[PDB]
Amino acid sequence: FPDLKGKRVLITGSSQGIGLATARLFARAGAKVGLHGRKAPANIDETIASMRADGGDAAFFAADLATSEACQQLVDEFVAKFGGIDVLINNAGGLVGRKPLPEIDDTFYDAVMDANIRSVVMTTKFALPHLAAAAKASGQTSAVISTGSIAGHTGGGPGAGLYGAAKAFLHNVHKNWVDFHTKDGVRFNIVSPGTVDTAFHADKTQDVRDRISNGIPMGRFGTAEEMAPAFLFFASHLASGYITGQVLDINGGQYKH
Amino acid sequence: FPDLKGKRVLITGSSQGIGLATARLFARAGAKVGLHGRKAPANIDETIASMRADGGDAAFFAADLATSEACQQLVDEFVAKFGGIDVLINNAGGLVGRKPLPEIDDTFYDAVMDANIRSVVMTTKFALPHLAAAAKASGQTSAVISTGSIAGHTGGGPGAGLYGAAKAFLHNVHKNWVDFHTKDGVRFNIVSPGTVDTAFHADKTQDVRDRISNGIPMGRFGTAEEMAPAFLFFASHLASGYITGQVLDINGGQYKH
Amino acid sequence: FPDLKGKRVLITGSSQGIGLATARLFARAGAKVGLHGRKAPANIDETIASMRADGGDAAFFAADLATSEACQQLVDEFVAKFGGIDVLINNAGGLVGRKPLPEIDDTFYDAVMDANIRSVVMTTKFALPHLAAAAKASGQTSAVISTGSIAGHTGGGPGAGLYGAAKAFLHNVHKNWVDFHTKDGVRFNIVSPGTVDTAFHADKTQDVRDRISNGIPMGRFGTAEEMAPAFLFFASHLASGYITGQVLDINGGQYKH
Amino acid sequence: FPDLKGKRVLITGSSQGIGLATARLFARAGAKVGLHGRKAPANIDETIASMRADGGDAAFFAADLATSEACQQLVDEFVAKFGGIDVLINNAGGLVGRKPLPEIDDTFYDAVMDANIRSVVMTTKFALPHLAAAAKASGQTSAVISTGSIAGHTGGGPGAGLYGAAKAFLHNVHKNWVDFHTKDGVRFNIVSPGTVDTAFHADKTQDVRDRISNGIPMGRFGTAEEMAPAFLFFASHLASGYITGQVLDINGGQYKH
Numbered sequence A, B, C, D: 001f002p003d004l005k006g007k008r009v010l011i012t013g014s015s016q017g018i019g020l021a022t023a024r025l026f027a028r029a030g031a032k033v034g035l036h037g038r039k040a041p042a043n044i045d046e047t048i049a050s051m052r053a054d055g056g057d058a059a060f061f062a063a064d065l066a067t068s069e070a071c072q073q074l075v076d077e078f079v080a081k082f083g084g085i086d087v088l089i090n091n092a093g094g095l096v097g098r099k100p101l102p103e104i105d106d107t108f109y110d111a112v113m114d115a116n117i118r119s120v121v122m123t124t125k126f127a128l129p130h131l132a133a134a135a136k137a138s139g140q141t142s143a144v145i146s147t148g149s150i151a152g153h154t155g156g157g158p159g160a161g162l163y164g165a166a167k168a169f170l171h172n173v174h175k176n177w178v179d180f181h182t183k184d185g186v187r188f189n190i191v192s193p194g195t196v197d198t199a200f201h202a203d204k205t206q207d208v209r210d211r212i213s214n215g216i217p218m219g220r221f222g223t224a225e226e227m228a229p230a231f232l233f234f235a236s237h238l239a240s241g242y243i244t245g246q247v248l249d250i251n252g253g254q255y256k257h
């Protein structure tokens, strides 16, 4: 999408997996990309070099987004480096762990809820004034894209009740954000991955992987690369200017939304 | 519903509104009802007397369910009083306040999320072994019924982004609970009120109420009493023994689920 | 439900299965029931006698509802017999046959679409003035309840693409009916069975049945009797007076709606 | 998307409106486009010239898709012209007319159902062997994209009950098609317009247009041009290769799916 050249794109949880594949694609489109994780990954500067060689720009920011303080600092550091924000991608998140209902204590509850919900709510909040300002300047829309999940539709797997429901929370809160912040020139959409071959599912044996694939019409897990184009699509005003408040599931037909 | 006579029914947030109307109906059906709120209503003993006159029993327990410890204590007190639990109704909840996204800070976030999510997760967790034991003893199912919202479908109203999304969270977490606790003899279902004439909407002026009613095919707010039968329906093994993991919206056609 | 005594209840496809189980329950509640099928069951008079012994009344009408003329005639005959209509249950329907997409020709298409859609649309159309008149006379609501399907959510099974989509059609058309006929005093709701042990699934071998049951949290097919109480619930103004435009899935957790 | 160059794209109902805008964009991507309507529009050869000058190719085919014979002939003529099919877009359809439930006769019913359902089912059926053959040859996927509607979610408007439910039927039938034809190398997705400024809404007065816009967060109708990129996205194997069985609503936030 030609209108992504020069766009300032902050992608949380882009140190690996879906976020990283997505960041790579934005850089190829000429975007200025904020790479993010809890820790700087090894060879982060190689990644930055690849992204620059593809015609974009990149910088890494470390933050554990479970606290609002880290969310505000991430936004501030990103704006300090690139001068504003056109696109926020709330992709940071994960299972944290697996605990069945009888085992859910406050510590685990807090960990899952902070990683998956507080992170998105607060990072979006802090980014919002910047996204709105960029929209006003261009006369076109800025974009928030959050990563959902198949689990936000049908429920979390074993020990993952809080995770699935946290994703359902995101699917819903976007609806409120559309209703009252469309007037700020910001579109909100969600990419909802199914079962994707990343670190997220690395613990699964081939036997478990085969059983899941049996319930997927395409008969396989997705790749991180198969998630990325949807993010660019939702980020592009030319592509999706009249699209807001939607969830797009990418899952080989596993769940039909 | 003849199989409700003698059933031990804990109803959170039954000190007033929908929870109270529901409690009154369970008592008419001969159930032993746990009444609950943050504070005792000024005429709680008259409510209890009326429920007993109607052929049931009642006892009041005060607890702020925003903390796990309070949820555990409520369940323990209820079990000490009536000897077990057959039905848990997770009805405690509310807006807490109205704050737009820019004004959503940690303290407010925590308040809404604890009141609406942690309360349900923890009360259900602590009630579960009792519910499972009652099901095993009877060879029939126990029931968890949680109060959702139209907002859990379409998003929270102004300043209610977290509230709407918290209800979406409940709608989703029930799906995980069904998948892995159906084997424990417990059915999980949701009653999802639309716009209902309780203290929840007491702050709405006449013109605002009428604006909302314009989007309701039945042309009016619902009553607390119009919510109550669905709760008894989901609680009754005879009525709904093969029904679990469902959300039933009661809203005069305002949202069609 | 005490307000069902004397109610005039036309139940299409009540000669067997879910419709029959439902009819029996209405008669136990004291309703006057219109029994219906394409052919009289070999022991229809014994069914009628049992319904009368239970405190209700019943009369059988034969009609193939694939044509509008037959739908009009059924409604007229029912009205001639019982003097009006308080509740219409659109339960007649079925697969007709199983043909994969490449084998879906005009004749098969017409057969499935007429049996499952035209039947519902036209029977409801012809019943509507009577339902409206009954509501006007009582000052309470009349009820239309249509039988949907899990398939109307997730898609038809092998060779059943048109059937699943026909049920989706029903789920949707009710929404239009609510928007513009709530003012006529009629509530429209749907009972959506999952996998139920009737003639509908009589062609399924034991290994196919247990394979489906593996995807059902309750681990078994439902019974016709487990469907029936929901129909009475939706028919009862006292029970569901503020409920309209809803779909209630009865499926042991197989699909969570 | 670079992988759309040379692709053979049959777009039903592309003589005007959304279908036409979509066709124009495919031609700009270098695709070979089958333009279609009931009648050759005036200046159709100018349109073909514009599309060729943009680096694509085009030919027009006349067919009323209400009959299976016309659907087969359209597919045959398209394949005769371009040698195969890579992408089918089922965009032909419309209200036909507005008749409230009491006014729905067989002729009107048949008209709406044939135009909106039989057309899609039969055209897809006839295209399927070609789409499958093209997928086998390339080793990638072919695409079917059907035009849905906001009405397929929330119901048809005044006199449009059958139209809304016909769109709901399409949303559902695609699910069956995914389940059993993903193995044929074909992906099926839906673009679901909200309120778009085409001939579809040309009858609406300024007053009515303003009141509808009030329920749209973006505060305006969409344009045909705002629908087009989503079709290209769903047609591109590179963009959406792991996406199948999805509905994407394009409606300025009017309905949040």
Ligand SMILES: NC(=O)c1ccc[n+]([C@@H]2O[C@H](COP(=O)([O-])OP(=O)(O)OC[C@H]3O[C@@H](n4cnc5c(N)ncnc54)[C@H](OP(=O)(O)O)[C@@H]3O)[C@@H](O)[C@H]2O)c1
Binding pocket: A012, A013, A014, A015, A016, A017, A018, A019, A036, A037, A038, A039, A063, A064, A065, A066, A091, A092, A093, A094, A095, A115, A147, A148, A149, A150, A192, A193, A194, A195, A196, A197, A198, A199, A200, A201
């Ligand atoms: N994979 C799937 O099948 C699937 C399905 C549905 C949804 N998702 C969602 O997809 C998104 C990306 O996950 P993935 O599959 O790409 O797995 P991944 O490889 O583990 O990536 C997760 C990313 O989130 C970051 N992150 C996690 N917790 C964080 C925290 N508290 N603060 C800041 N950053 C944090 C991680 O940073 P570090 O490098 O510091 O750990 C990492 O960059 C997640 O939101 C996940 O919920 C994945």
Ligand SMILES: NC(=O)c1ccc[n+]([C@@H]2O[C@H](COP(=O)([O-])OP(=O)(O)OC[C@H]3O[C@@H](n4cnc5c(N)ncnc54)[C@H](OP(=O)(O)O)[C@@H]3O)[C@@H](O)[C@H]2O)c1
Binding pocket: B012, B013, B014, B015, B016, B017, B018, B019, B036, B037, B038, B039, B040, B063, B064, B065, B066, B091, B092, B093, B094, B095, B115, B119, B147, B148, B149, B150, B192, B193, B194, B195, B196, B197, B198, B199, B200, B201
């Ligand atoms: N009314 C509607 O239109 C509507 C619509 C959708 C959903 N709902 C839901 O329906 C449920 C009942 O509310 P209502 O409409 O009947 O309003 P209500 O009159 O305010 O009742 C709410 C009940 O929840 C209790 N509660 C609130 N916060 C609590 C806490 N932190 N800990 C323990 N108990 C708490 C209240 O006790 P106290 O009075 O002692 O604080 C009260 O008994 C709520 O979950 C609400 O979210 C209502």
Ligand SMILES: NC(=O)c1ccc[n+]([C@@H]2O[C@H](COP(=O)([O-])OP(=O)(O)OC[C@H]3O[C@@H](n4cnc5c(N)ncnc54)[C@H](OP(=O)(O)O)[C@@H]3O)[C@@H](O)[C@H]2O)c1
Binding pocket: C012, C013, C014, C015, C016, C017, C018, C019, C036, C037, C038, C039, C040, C063, C064, C065, C066, C091, C092, C093, C094, C095, C115, C119, C147, C148, C149, C150, C192, C193, C194, C195, C196, C197, C198, C199, C200, C201
């Ligand atoms: N069983 C399940 O798992 C399941 C699941 C989802 C939905 N459903 C729906 O449940 C409803 C009842 O079916 P069931 O399971 O009870 O199976 P059933 O025993 O085959 O009952 C179907 C009833 O519909 C009548 N019928 C069929 N075609 C008709 C026509 N063209 N005109 C008039 N009446 C017609 C049948 O009459 P005759 O016997 O005289 O032909 C019979 O009374 C159907 O709408 C079905 O689609 C069933």
Ligand SMILES: NC(=O)c1ccc[n+]([C@@H]2O[C@H](COP(=O)([O-])OP(=O)(O)OC[C@H]3O[C@@H](n4cnc5c(N)ncnc54)[C@H](OP(=O)(O)O)[C@@H]3O)[C@@H](O)[C@H]2O)c1
Binding pocket: D012, D013, D014, D015, D016, D017, D018, D019, D036, D037, D038, D039, D063, D064, D065, D066, D091, D092, D093, D094, D095, D115, D147, D148, D149, D150, D151, D192, D193, D194, D195, D196, D197, D198, D199, D200, D201
């Ligand atoms: N506009 C909206 O707001 C909106 C919203 C939701 C869904 N849609 C859907 O969008 C699609 C395109 O409509 P539009 O808005 O672009 O309106 P449009 O300008 O009227 O386009 C409709 C197209 O469908 C063709 N068509 C209609 N009936 C046909 C038939 N029986 N056989 C063959 N072709 C037929 C028409 O051909 P002719 O030129 O021969 O008439 C025309 O090319 C339709 O499926 C409509 O249901 C539109």
